């Protein structure tokens, strides 16, 4: 699968995925800023389970790989969040990832 998404500041987007099988996910994204890190800009990467436990989480995300399996409920959330101040063009986040 493949994303792509204008990431707003101080704004949060996520996929969201409820499969039924115990597999292996895997993941790579970069996040591009025209702006160079304007207003402190920095971007949060977080992947969770069903239960809220981390599968992932990458505290200043720029570009990078990431792999989890599914397990209990087989259903995970990939969220990111940016956090900046003033007026800062969107980011732009490419994410592809593959199933097992």
């Given at each position: 699968g493949?994303?792509?998404?204008?990431?707003?500041?101080?704004?949060?987007?996520?996929?969201?995925?409820?499969?039924?099988?115990?597999?292996?996910?895997?993941?790579?994204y970069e996040i591009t800023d025209q702006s160079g890190g304007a207003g402190g800009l920095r971007t949060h990467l977080k992947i969770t389970d069903?239960?809220?436990?981390?599968?992932?989480?990458?505290?200043?995300?720029?570009?990078g790989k990431?792999?989890?399996?599914?397990?209990?409920?087989?259903?995970?959330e990939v969220c990111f969040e940016s956090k900046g101040t003033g007026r800062i063009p969107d980011q732009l986040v490419i994410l592809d990832m593959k199933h097992g």
């Open positions: 493949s994303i792509s998404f204008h990431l707003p500041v101080n704004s949060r987007k996520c996929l969201r995925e409820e499969i039924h099988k115990d597999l292996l996910v895997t993941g790579a069903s239960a809220g436990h981390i599968l992932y989480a990458k505290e200043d995300a720029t570009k990431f792999a989890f399996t599914t397990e209990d409920y087989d259903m995970f």
